[PDB]
């Protein structure tokens, strides 16, 4: 198969609020696949659906041809050794230094001798670039270094699907460039399949190979970077250029004006 | 899904894949498996992940601690790009 | 009234169900204790050792207050030599376990809830699930067993320190004869059954307090405001449960 | 959802039954 | 930052044991 | 190592005490102290007093019941079971009432205040209030302090008057003591003005101490979400220790 | 005077860490003035210095020719009716709806009759665009609507210096465009003097008239948008394009490699 | 720093600045100050902030509630741009 | 750390003096 992850007519609602309404996207194997959309739409749930942490209401989520919500618990825990999330807060364990955080998956699942494990953890921390901070606690780390250490942890077990969860949100262009270089050269060297769910268009579209703009609870458009930077649609074009007023109302729904002005 | 080393004199040659599941059978007896060699063959190795590189570096170091300067042979270029990702100096992994 | 009362009832029933499910899924396991010693020791440090200064300093003061209020009552009937019996029994029966449980819910019962809620906020539980490490077996059960092991020991320390504080007030300050105090206290009341009842109610309090703490820390809304609403709820519900279970256990074990 | 509610009803029933047999062993 | 935890848990267990012995020796 | 560490901890504790004193002082000096502050003080009495009332009532019932049981079992060996009302009332009005009310108020309402003020400081609401020339110490610290001070003695009175009823339930209704003897013995013999006034005095002292510690820890917490949850625990711990210590001191002063 | 705020040789350090080391910047009257720099450098303290919330160690902060740290408390509270911060978290009072939040400064400092006050608050909520949400609690608001309501509050007392504190951090291009349009048209209509302390270069430089790039505890460069998009300096150019590796080390200081790799 | 209205027949004319400090002297007696007018002069007004616009809108409304359709005169264009910022319709503020 | 160590030693001496003053009550 060429589609590593393949959603089909999946719909998910919490409470009574329809978060997703019959969406279906395909993640090609070996290529970055952005999933953009407006903030607050809950597009990070789209990753917890692939991770099996929550089950959808309809549709199917085929991971390498295997329906995820239908799997058991042991089979799920076996499959999860192929996926790796990267939460925007790093999600580092605060009771152990960076070295122990990176070594946790290796020390948990693989039977590696202590010298080999130390060498592997140092190699990965050098790959990301935090080898000098192999003794710092997660609290002593900055905001971008935490995400970089969590990325070093995510590539520990040599996965084949790294689901990034808004890695660029709220960071200076230096750290954005560092992170985008890391993601690009990891997709190039290791051949992993990234899924960048973010809303920082100018940086995300610099690497993405097939983006999926997600607005209004469904999928509005999708294609390459060029096929999106030239798609003549009001919603898509508004979201891409950052136009203030458009199909999304700049003014909150209010109604009359005189009654509020002169009560 | 198998690892088997067979040194022909002073030329250690590995076989099959090389990853975290089969590192132990070679790491248990790394010394006699590296004693008196000058050429670590890798042409008969299909896939080498990070653990494979760690084992290769440790073997090269253990051989360098015996005088004979080690030269790799038949190394797949995928190993080379995956090692340049980790930014390995030419001191520990002779090209 | 009935429009929201039934919704609240089914919500409370679902809450009890979630708590029971969390406990059952976190406790069933054979490989539980081994390979978890470096976890249980750290948790005994966090829950137990850090919550020892408050226990000692409060036991001293409660022993002193009991000594004063028992002397001022017994000096009327010329029974001030039974102050040791009075202090020891009032500590081993009600004050010891209940006050130890309240202070444990305050210091270590809220720290667990805050820690687990924050661990859920920074998405460490989901990140631990993503690498095939069941958190209920990796992060809940060590804390549960640390609390269950550590409260009945803080209770023993609290008792053996309050008895000494009552000795300070009665024997040293007020001037009772030490021989009468100690001999009167040991033969008359310190039977094996009083200590056993103290430990039994202490273990029950440990179980309920640490369960409420872990559940409220595991069921909290991840926002930084839902955690503080879960710490206060932990303290409140744990104090209420401690007092209710204490009344029930007293009615059971003392006629 | 249903399983959680059922576990809750069962746990509350067991708790109240334990408390009831206790209080019946207490008054008399 | 782990031998600290070990020795402190040891001291705590020793203090609990000393307290239990104090009580059980002023008990009979 | 001890000399440097002990000196640093002593200097830090002196600094903390000084900052707490300065906060309370600057919060309790003003002319409009109570006028134009009626809605603020009413909302704070609701958040501190009314919401912390169910726990007080239930705990009073249960402690009254435990006292009734453990007093009947002690007095039945001397046929003085009719003095159970006196015993319960005095044990509540002297030690258990004020101290337990203070502990539960520091747990329920002493931690809520610390958490609320720490969160108000995390979202920069206090800085946003200072930036529009509205002294926060006079706007968010004083109403909450006065709400706590006004609301703990009332909670203590409710706690007592409920524990007495619980002790009556256990002694009179269940154990079968004569109700007339119970009440009459209790009322005539020992509940004079001095027993009450002392209860209110130590309750007011506990109120001041608990609410001050809580407000200061909520106002001095590190704004991060891990500095708030670390300040709530410190609030509960320090408040319980201060309640018990001040209670021992006040008992030694007022009774013996 | 033309410089509304005028720092001169101000230096501020907390603990032992030199945050600012002899910086000096001038804020012209009536023009937006960005202050950019790397994240985590503490460039938001530069606003608390102007607000007088904290006092510097040296230098002077002249507000309209009046040294701020030397002022008394009553004079400070009188001056603060001219400034207005906008914290990135909105800093809305959670115990009152949007209307009461916006009316707080009016209801506190001015003696306006209730009808006039209601009309003014509705006018300002319409100016920002949240008039329809005049009854929502701050918790029911989104992440950008909170900042918009706080901006409606900041312009209540008709100030002449609105110190924005990273208003664009972590938001989709739609909300960034809405906020930049609001800031531009407020600087145009009301004639207020904005100070945007942010690190989102492509959006901030779209309005700023004289930016001040602040790196390495001092000021590295300053000028118009064009004078910065053409300044040939390694640090400035790295920060502006988002170049991953440059004068700022991409790799954390580590040292040797063999000793960490082969212990 | 002064506000003083002097209606010349049916033409109310305001003077000086117009802001939050001096709104009361006119709002206290808005009715007799607007009775029977058809032209609210503003040429003698230097600065008009938001409170001034609120008072102007309320005066125009109170006059419209008496039949005579109100026409503004001598309005500074700064008032117009500051009112278009608030997006005021032509119904409440006749240009 | 000189003045800090001095203040710490002074606090220790004050605690010892307070313990001795409490010993003036009895034993
Ligand atoms: C705060 C959180 C919740 C708290 C819950 C509240 C509960 C508080 C618990 C406090 C008390 C619990 C029980 C402890 C007490 C206890 O039981 O023993 C205490 C023992 C009972 O001993 P016992 O073995 O019979 O029992 O009495 C005693 O010393 C008194 C014995 C000496 C008194 C003799 C006086 C004689 C009076 C008349 C004399 C007639 C003279 C004849 C004339 C010639
Ligand atoms: C948890 C936080 C800290 C808790 C502190 C612990 C305090 C618990 C209760 C202490 C309050 C004061 C003591 C209450 C008694 C009182 O005071 O009166 C009670 C009055 C004295 O009346 P009077 O002479 O004072 O007048 O005797 C009586 O009716 C008894 C009448 C004759 C029977 C003799 C029995 C002797 C035992 C009495 C004590 C029973 C145990 C209670 C002591 C713990």
Numbering used by the authors:
A (entry chain J), G (entry chain I): 5 to 267
B (entry chain L), H (entry chain K): 3 to 97
C (entry chain H): 5 to 259
D (entry chain E): 4 to 31
E (entry chain D): 2 to 29
F (entry chain G): 4 to 259
I (entry chain C): 4 to 30
Study text:
The Mla system, an ABC transporter in E. coli and related Gram-negative bacteria, has recently emerged as a key player in phospholipid transport across the bacterial envelope. Mla trafficks phospholipids between the IM and OM and is important for maintaining the outer membrane barrier. The IM complex, MlaFEDB, consists of four different proteins: MlaD, a membrane anchored protein from the MCE (Mammalian Cell Entry) protein family, which forms a homohexameric ring in the periplasm; MlaE (also called YrbE), a predicted integral inner membrane ABC permease; MlaF, an ABC ATPase; and MlaB, a STAS (Sulfate Transporter and Anti-Sigma factor antagonist) domain protein with possible regulatory function. The MlaFEDB transporter is significantly larger and more complicated than most other structurally characterized ABC transporters, consisting of a total of 12 polypeptide chains from four different genes, with a stoichiometry of MlaF2E2D6B2.
In addition, we resolved both coils of the membrane scaffold protein (MSP) belt surrounding the nanodisc using the map filtered at 6 Å, thereby clearly defining the position of the transmembrane domain. Our cryo-EM structure reveals that the core TMD of MlaE consists of five transmembrane helices (TM1 - TM5). While the vast majority of ABC transporter structures adopt an inward-open conformation in the absence of nucleotide, our structure of MlaE is in the outward-open state. Indeed, in our structure of the MlaFEDB complex, the pore of MlaD and the outward-open pocket of MlaE line up with each other, resulting in a continuous hydrophobic pathway that runs from the pocket of MlaE, through MlaD, and out into the periplasm. Additional density was apparent in the outward-open pocket of MlaE, which is the right size and shape to accommodate two diacyl phospholipids. We modeled these as the most abundant PL species in E. coli, phosphatidylethanolamine, and these lipids make extensive contacts with both MlaE subunits, as well as MlaD. Strikingly, the second lipid (lipid 2) adopts an extended conformation, with one acyl chain reaching down into the MlaE pocket, while the other projects upwards to insert into a constriction in the MlaD pore formed by Leu106 and Leu107, which have previously been implicated in MlaD function. Thus, the asymmetry in MlaD appears to arise from its asymmetric interactions with lipid 1 at the interface of MlaE and MlaD.
